[PDB]
Amino acid sequence: MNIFEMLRIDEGLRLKIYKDTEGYYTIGIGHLLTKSPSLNAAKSELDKAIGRNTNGVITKDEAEKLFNQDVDAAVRGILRNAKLKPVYDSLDAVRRAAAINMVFQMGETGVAGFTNSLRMLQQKRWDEAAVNLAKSRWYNQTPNRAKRVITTFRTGTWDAYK
Numbered sequence: 001m002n003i004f005e006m007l008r009i010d011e012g013l014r015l016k017i018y019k020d021t022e023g024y025y026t027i028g029i030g031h032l033l034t035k036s037p038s039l040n041a042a043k044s045e046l047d048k049a050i051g052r053n054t055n056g057v058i059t060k061d062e063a064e065k066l067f068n069q070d071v072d073a074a075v076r077g078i079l080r081n082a083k084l085k086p087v088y089d090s091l092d093a094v095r096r097a098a099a100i101n102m103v104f105q106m107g108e109t110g111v112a113g114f115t116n117s118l119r120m121l122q123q124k125r126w127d128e129a130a131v132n133l134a135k136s137r138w139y140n141q142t143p144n145r146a147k148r149v150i151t152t153f154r155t156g157t158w159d160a161y162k
């Protein structure tokens with residue numbers, strides 16, 4: 001198991017523009033196109049990201065290409081964030097994957113709001129962090145996914161993904 005497989009499991013793969021759990025236009029492997037309520041705006045953003053007139057549909061390869069780009073950006077974003085980096089540097093390889101998953105999902109900003117959990121993770125107090133992570137909108141809105149990520153930080157293993 002690795003970050004790519006983990007996210008592929010959490011996000012699925014769709015080749016046609018769709019609305020995510022928050023109702024925002026997305027495509028591929030969880031690639032957010034726009035928060036705008038307009039499909040046209042979404043189709044424009046899509047064409048711009050792919051570099052062609054897509055008509056709201058992309059191929060598997062194009063999807064995987066966006067995904068590669070998005071994973072890379074998440075990681076790089078964590079390493080550039082002064083709040084995040086030190087936490088991430090402190091983690092083992094499995095837990096780093098859980099950290100990337102959360103940023104991929106909610107953005108660096110979204111995560112930057114888990115200040116108390118971050119500190120717990122940094123201190124390696126696993127069970128407590130797990131409990132704190134669960135007291136969040138994130139958990140209440142996407143409970144099954146959150147459970148898997150939370151178990152990952154708790155255990156340091158891929159059991160939730162098997």
Ligand SMILES: c1ccc2occc2c1
Binds near residue numbers: 078084087088
């Ligand atoms: C970067 C570093 C550590 C993290 O813990 C949870 C999210 C996250 C992101």
Ligand SMILES: [Cl-]
Binds near residue numbers: 049
């Ligand atoms: Cl893009």
Ligand SMILES: [Cl-]
Binds near residue numbers: 141146
């Ligand atoms: Cl879920």
